[PDB]
């Protein structure tokens, strides 16, 4: 395999949102504080969301005859399709 | 809030090794909109 496949996987494997921001974002909405578990669970679900948007945009960019990096027009178009398929809120 | 983690995350999912900044931020806003929605919906259930 290539250095890139390897490095693309590493990134995938450990990419993750900082707990601090996830927690301040959530608590600043419930007023009450929140648990360790809630923050980790919320991070796992958000990573999957991110995953579905990038994977869907990559598809749009591929079908519009373009090449990565993903452009803004790809993200928003992807978001519209995901909503139609009703797979993202 | 989370631009670097989001950049490695987008790369780990198939985007160019070095994504565009305007894209990283749109994504951020969407993640934020997303967490806010789950939260509010979890508060109910």
UniProtKB/Swiss-Prot annotation, chain A:
<comment type="subunit">
    <text>Component of the TFIID basal transcription factor complex, composed of TATA-box-binding protein TBP, and a number of TBP-associated factors (TAFs), including TAF1, TAF2, TAF3, TAF4, TAF5, TAF6, TAF7, TAF8, TAF9, TAF10, TAF11, TAF12 and TAF13. Interacts with TAF13 both in vitro and intracellularly; also interacts directly with TBP.</text>
</comment>
<comment type="function">
    <text>The TFIID basal transcription factor complex plays a major role in the initiation of RNA polymerase II (Pol II)-dependent transcription. TFIID recognizes and binds promoters with or without a TATA box via its subunit TBP, a TATA-box-binding protein, and promotes assembly of the pre-initiation complex (PIC). The TFIID complex consists of TBP and TBP-associated factors (TAFs), including TAF1, TAF2, TAF3, TAF4, TAF5, TAF6, TAF7, TAF8, TAF9, TAF10, TAF11, TAF12 and TAF13.</text>
</comment>
<protein>
    <recommendedName>
        <fullName>Transcription initiation factor TFIID subunit 11</fullName>
    </recommendedName>
</protein>
<comment type="similarity">
    <text>Belongs to the TAF11 family.</text>
</comment>
Swiss-Prot record, chain B:
<comment type="subunit">
    <text>Component of the TFIID basal transcription factor complex, composed of TATA-box-binding protein TBP, and a number of TBP-associated factors (TAFs), including TAF1, TAF2, TAF3, TAF4, TAF5, TAF6, TAF7, TAF8, TAF9, TAF10, TAF11, TAF12 and TAF13. Interacts with TBP, and more strongly with TAF10 and TAF11.</text>
</comment>
<comment type="function">
    <text>The TFIID basal transcription factor complex plays a major role in the initiation of RNA polymerase II (Pol II)-dependent transcription. TFIID recognizes and binds promoters via its subunit TBP, a TATA-box-binding protein, and promotes assembly of the pre-initiation complex (PIC). The TFIID complex consists of TBP and TBP-associated factors (TAFs), including TAF1, TAF2, TAF3, TAF4, TAF5, TAF6, TAF7, TAF8, TAF9, TAF10, TAF11, TAF12 and TAF13. TAF13, together with TAF11 and TBP, play key roles during promoter binding by the TFIID and TFIIA transcription factor complexes.</text>
</comment>
<protein>
    <recommendedName>
        <fullName>Transcription initiation factor TFIID subunit 13</fullName>
    </recommendedName>
</protein>
<feature type="domain" description="Histone-fold">
    <location>
        <begin position="1"/>
        <end position="44"/>
    </location>
</feature>
<comment type="similarity">
    <text>Belongs to the TAF13 family.</text>
</comment>
């Amino acid at each position: 395999f290539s250095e890139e496949q390897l490095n693309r996987y590493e990134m995938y494997r450990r990419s993750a949102f900082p707990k601090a921001a996830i927690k301040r974002l959530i608590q600043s909405i419930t007023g009450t504080s929140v648990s360790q578990n809630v923050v980790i669970a919320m991070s796992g679900i958000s990573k999957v969301f991110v995953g579905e948007v990038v994977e869907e945009a990559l598809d749009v960019c591929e079908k519009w005859g373009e090449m990565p990096p993903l452009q803004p027009k790809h993200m928003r178009e992807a978001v519209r399709r995901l909503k139609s398929k009703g797979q993202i809120p | 809030l989370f631009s670097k983690e989001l950049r490695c995350m987008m790369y780990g999912f198939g985007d160019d090794q070095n994504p565009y900044t305007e894209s990283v931020d749109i994504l951020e806003d969407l993640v934020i909109e997303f967490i806010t929605e789950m939260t509010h919906k979890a508060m109910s259930i």
